[PDB]
């Protein structure tokens, strides 16, 4: 009766999740090490945007480092890493989703403030303030994700599969609101304010428009399906293949939401500093150091 949806669900986990997470792992690992090493080698004086972007990259690397375990468990259909790594991986996955959109919310507020006060005279525009905020994003998101621990009761299942669906749906709905929808509308609010400032007098709008687009498109199918998935586990939910179909649709959306960790290093090239030009120049300086002998140039000339 629902054997087709069941065979499909197994195929989706075995081949689709493992191939899509595998691409995210390569793209994400390369892009995030490029920009991370780029900041540690090129950037000597950091502003608010630099701090958040760097933090966004730590959040991505924390999640991307768990992907080889997920890929193997899906490809073989068995979790061999034990309970603790299962819990800690579920945490970094969700901590990445929610710290990511918050880091972008704070970059958008930085870009708006910089538009009005380019000399960073205000307390909210200082790098010491950015560090405290960054720490507060890590503390807040950890506390938002912590109630998931109560749902773990009854190999390494997705949060939407474990615990009482009645309580889990409420929590999921609050987590969608606090973690996704409110930071998204805050960016939209700051997008509107930037437009009003510009119309009264396009480059600073790029970052906010792109962040609203990327998060709207990547997080919406995942967040709708996660709430539909949990609701479909309720006793009051109708009988049939609907539950199995929803399981399949939900699985398709998960790597789409997690694409964030591979595509969000793009925000480093939208802060007006010519970072790309700095990357090639520094790379050229390491290539030109091979031929040129500065130890002999100073000694003879």
């Amino acid at each position: 009766s629902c054997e087709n949806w069941l065979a499909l669900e197994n195929i989706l986990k075995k081949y689709y999740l493992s191939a899509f997470y595998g691409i995210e792992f390569i793209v994400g690992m390369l892009g995030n090490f490029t920009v991370v090493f780029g900041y540690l080698f090129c950037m000597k004086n950091w502003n608010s945007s630099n701090v958040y972007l760097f933090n966004l990259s730590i959040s991505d690397l924390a999640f991307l480092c768990t992907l080889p375990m997920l890929i193997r468990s899906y490809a073989t259909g068995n979790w061999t890493y034990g309970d603790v790594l299962c819990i800690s991986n579920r945490y970094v996955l969700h901590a990445n989703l929610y710290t990511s959109i918050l880091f972008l919310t704070f970059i958008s507020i930085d870009r708006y403030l910089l538009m009005k006060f380019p000399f960073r005279e205000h307390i909210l525009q200082k790098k010491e303030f950015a560090i405290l905020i960054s720490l507060a994003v890590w503390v807040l998101v950890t506390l938002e994700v912590l109630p998931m621990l109560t749902f773990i009761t009854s190999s390494c299942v997705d949060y939407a599969s474990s615990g009482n669906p009645k309580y889990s749906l409420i929590y999921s709905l609050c987590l969608t609101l606090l973690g996704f929808l409110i930071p998204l509308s805050v960016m939209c609010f700051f997008y509107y304010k930037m437009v009003v400032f510009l119309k009264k007098r396009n480059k600073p709008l790029r970052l906010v428009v792109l962040a609203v687009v990327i998060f709207s498109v990547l997080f919406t199918p995942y967040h709708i399906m996660r709430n539909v998935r949990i609701a479909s586990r309720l006793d009051s939910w109708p009988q049939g293949c609907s539950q199995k179909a929803i399981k399949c649709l939900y699985i398709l959306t998960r790597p789409l939401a997690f694409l964030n960790s591979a595509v969000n290093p793009i925000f480093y090239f939208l802060v007006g500093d010519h970072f790309r030009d700095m990357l090639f120049s520094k790379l050229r300086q390491y290539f030109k150091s091979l031929t040129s002998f500065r130890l002999l140039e100073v000694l003879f000339q």
Epitope: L114, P118, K203, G272, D273
Partner: nanobody
């Protein structure tokens, strides 16, 4: 490009000074120019910036008092300083960003990326 600042000296509170930033051998056309100041023991503070596109930015401390401009041929950058107060006493420097549309977005951060600076010119406001 080699930069050199002119103008500046003693001025009475309420007085005016016009500083000049010249690039002795070539045009400041493809460059963004920033005016920065440093009082003894204090941190370097951005005051004003002009983009290659002619856009102008001013710090909250000098807005509605200072005017940055480029001459007719656009060879020199000027900093007109009106209603000068003792708090404007500092060594004033100019800096040039070859990415003409970059510097004035974030002058205090992006100044850290710049290699071309002038020697500085002393401005003293006292009665």
């Amino acid at each position: 490009v080699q930069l050199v600042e002119s103008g500046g000296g003693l001025v009475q509170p309420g007085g005016s000074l016009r500083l000049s930033c010249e690039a002795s051998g070539y045009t400041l056309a493809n460059y963004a120019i920033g005016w920065f100041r440093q009082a003894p023991g204090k941190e370097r503070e951005g005051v004003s910036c002009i983009s290659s596109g002619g856009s102008t930015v001013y710090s909250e401390s000098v807005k509605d008092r200072f005017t940055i401009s480029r001459d007719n041929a656009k060879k020199i950058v000027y900093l007109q300083m009106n209603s000068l107060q003792p708090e404007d006493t500092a060594v004033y420097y100019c800096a040039a960003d070859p990415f003409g549309e970059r510097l004035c977005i974030d002058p205090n951060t992006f100044a850290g990326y710049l290699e071309t600076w002038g020697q500085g010119t002393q401005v003293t406001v006292s009665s």
